[PDB]
Amino acid sequence: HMNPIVVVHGGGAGPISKDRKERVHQGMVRAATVGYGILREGGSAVDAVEGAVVALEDDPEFNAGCGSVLNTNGEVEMDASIMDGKDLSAGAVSAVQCIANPIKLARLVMEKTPHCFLTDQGAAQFAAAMGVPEIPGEKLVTERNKKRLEKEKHGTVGAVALDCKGNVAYATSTGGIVNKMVGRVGDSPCLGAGGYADNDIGAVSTVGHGESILKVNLARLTLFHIEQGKTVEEAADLSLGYMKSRVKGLGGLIVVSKTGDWVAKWTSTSMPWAAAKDGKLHFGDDTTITDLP
Amino acid sequence: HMNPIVVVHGGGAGPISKDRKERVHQGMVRAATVGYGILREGGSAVDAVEGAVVALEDDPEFNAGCGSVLNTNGEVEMDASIMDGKDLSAGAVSAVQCIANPIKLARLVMEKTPHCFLTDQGAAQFAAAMGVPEIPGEKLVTERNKKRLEKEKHTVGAVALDCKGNVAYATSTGGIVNKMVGRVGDSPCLGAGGYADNDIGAVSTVGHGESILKVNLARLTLFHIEQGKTVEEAADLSLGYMKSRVKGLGGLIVVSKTGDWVAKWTSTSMPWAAAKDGKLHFGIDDTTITDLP
Ligand code: NA
Ligand code: NA
């Protein structure tokens, strides 16, 4: 049987504040830490990525749950998905407000309904039906997010894991893009676009311009290139160069193949990431390693 | 310049009488004739797929626009998408309500917004700004579907090649009978509902929505075409894999950039048609080409 791994990442932000580099890396490393503490315990590939994105949703620095950006009405609208690479089970939600963890709501769609995708008003009904609390949105909205929005009229988070049984998964959540149209939906909740997980290949999650990612099927494509024997890195660079030259898009990828191989590559300015593997945290090409206490 | 081709299909409903069948037959002819017509004025594949689709929507015998099946709460909530092979531009809607023509709203999302995908309330506000007529919730409701919901409680598409080498797909549905509210199928998940890329081809899928999502069929079929399977063999394997991995039946239509087109299926039925060379094609097996009337 195999050694687990978790990779996580978020959408790159271009140039940022020193204490923000600092707080983002801390939020990344906590997400990895949380994910691998589920794997080190015998948790599944799914529980690891569910737990790891919940971390990123709950942390106000990240555009996902609390910290999600405001739409063109100044309201939080949120998408997410998660997928079981064993059998292709998956769950997704689009256009949701007033809940803390859509990644958690996306898990219940997969497991508790004979469906993969709920949206908007309908997603709230299952939310309420499932004892998912209701919050005032003002606790997702930051003042910073109010600010950014005003100035507009003048990224995502994700996780992949391979668990002790060789099972893989991905999870992804986002508040989208500042000033998006009411009910705009991007890559996250669309399987193969934002993510895809498969025990015959591997697991990808993606960040960057949602429209560019969905038009190219950026995660499934990534998994297509490994399906013809490219290495996880040759694949990743092949798919991101295609989104760049074909639809002018940029972004990042984290992949772990069915053998434990992995990489973090982005065609954008930067991309926040950390990974966890063989008791070591990998951070980041300034990738640097430490022990997992 | 290319001999233009348009193909239409609807999902099967298993064996049906003749009284239903000829209706279903006429419908495939009309939408395929609308689409052929448009390509005869040398119009675009994006134009043609749209029109074929609009026609099935208006035809109450098909499960899209007027005469969509019902969700669990007694009502119609519709899904649609459109894609252009030229530069992969897309537009899609999901769980849109009380309008006649979901597919046109998809193309409006394509052409007049920065995004590619809007849902529920944002799709509704958007369409209202386009002056899409909000139409009565019960003109969209037919009485045969009332029974289908009442019994139970106790997709269509087109692909096209124009005379300038472009490909395109569109699709439309009311979903699955008795679906949870807000349930989003494959029809608006680019890569699953359909795919169009001028460099490879265009595809449309009917069948079990969630499975089609899971195996990402539309893009799946095209992977093989790229790798060099014929269109017939691409459907056999794309659809092969859907049956083996997720145990879902369905079927597809597909057109190559080389103008070779096929319709193939694993379900019991897939009423389809194709119009190329001043001819109509159809067949449960024994294919029947009649000159175009
Ligand atoms: Na957050
Ligand atoms: Na109809």
Q: Where are the domains of chain B?
A: 1-293
Reading the block at residue A235, the tokens are 């694949």
Reading the block at residue A65, the tokens are 């749950």
Q: What is the DSSP letter of A76?
A: B
Q: Would an 8 Å CB–CB cutoff place B234 in contact with chain A?
A: no
Contact A31, A160 (CB under 8 A): no
Q: What is the DSSP letter of A68?
A: P
CA gap B11, A59 in Å, rounded: 44
Q: Would an 8 Å CB–CB cutoff place B242 in contact with chain A?
A: no
3-state secondary structure (DSSP) of residue A163: coil
Closest CB from B124, B125, B189 relative to A190:
B189
Q: CA-CA-CA-CA torsion for A81, B46, B208, B185, nearest 10 degrees?
A: 40
Residue B156 exposure: Cα atoms within 13 Å on the Cβ side: 38
Residue for token pair 């009423």: B271
Residue A131 contacts by C-beta under 8 Å, 6 or more apart in sequence?
Answer: none
Residue for token pair 């948790």: A43
Beta partners for residue A90, in sequence order: A83
Q: Would an 8 Å CB–CB cutoff place A214 in contact with chain B?
A: yes
> What's the angle, vertex CA B91, arms to CA B256 and CA B45, rounded to 5?
35
Element containing residue B123 per DSSP (H, E) = helix B120-129
Reading the block at residue B203, the tokens are 């595809």
How many helices (H) and strands (E) are present in chain A, helices listed first? 8, 13
Contact B5, B161 (CB under 8 A): yes
Contact B173, B68 (CB under 8 A): yes
Contact B193, B206 (CB under 8 A): no
Partner-chain contact A116 B219, CB within 8 Å: no
Residue B270 contacts by C-beta under 8 Å, 6 or more apart in sequence?
Answer: B9, B10, B11, B12, B206, B251, B263
Q: Which of A156, A172, A174, A222 is catalytic?
A: A156
Reading the block at residue A161, the tokens are 């894991």
Beta partners for residue A80, in sequence order: A93, A173
CA gap A217, A228 in Å, rounded: 17
Q: Would an 8 Å CB–CB cutoff place A217 in contact with chain B?
A: yes
Which among A95, A68, A177 has a CA at the least distance from the CA of B118? A95
CA gap A199, A84 in Å, rounded: 9
Give A128's contacts in chain B (Cβ within 8 Å): none
Which among B53, B60, B39, B37 has a CA at the least distance from the CA of B293? B37
Backbone angles phi, psi at B227, to 5 degrees: -70, -10
Give the method used: X-ray
Element containing residue B106 per DSSP (H, E) = helix B102-112
Contact B78, B95 (CB under 8 A): yes
Tell me the structure's resolution in angstroms, rounded to a single decimal.
2.1
Which among B171, B240, B161 has a CA at the least distance from the CA of B205? B171
Q: Is the sign of the CA dihedral B285, B286, B292, B293 positive or negative?
A: negative
Give Dmax (Cα) for chain A: 56
**A119 given a catalytic annotation:** no
CA gap B96, B130 in Å, rounded: 14
Contact A25, A50 (CB under 8 A): no
Reading the block at residue B43, the tokens are 């119009």
Q: Between the CA of residue A28 and those of A65, A131, A141, what are the distances in Å?
A: 15, 29, 20
Reading the block at residue B256, the tokens are 């190559």
Q: Is B35 left (phi over 0), alpha (psi -120 to 50) or beta?
A: alpha
Give B126's contacts in chain A (Cβ within 8 Å): 181-183
CA gap A20, A25 in Å, rounded: 8
CA gap B190, B188 in Å, rounded: 6
Partner-chain contact A121 B183, CB within 8 Å: no
> What's the angle, vertex CA B8, arms to CA B7 and CA B11, rounded to 5?
140
How many helices (H) and strands (E) are present in chain B, helices listed first? 8, 13
Give A88's contacts in chain B (Cβ within 8 Å): 214-215, 245-246
Q: For B209, name the nearest residue in chain A, comparing CA atoms only.
A: A115
Beta partners for residue B81, in sequence order: B92, B171
3-state secondary structure (DSSP) of residue A253: strand
Partner-chain contact B87 A186, CB within 8 Å: no
Which among A185, A238, A241, A246 has a CA at the least distance from the CA of A215? A246
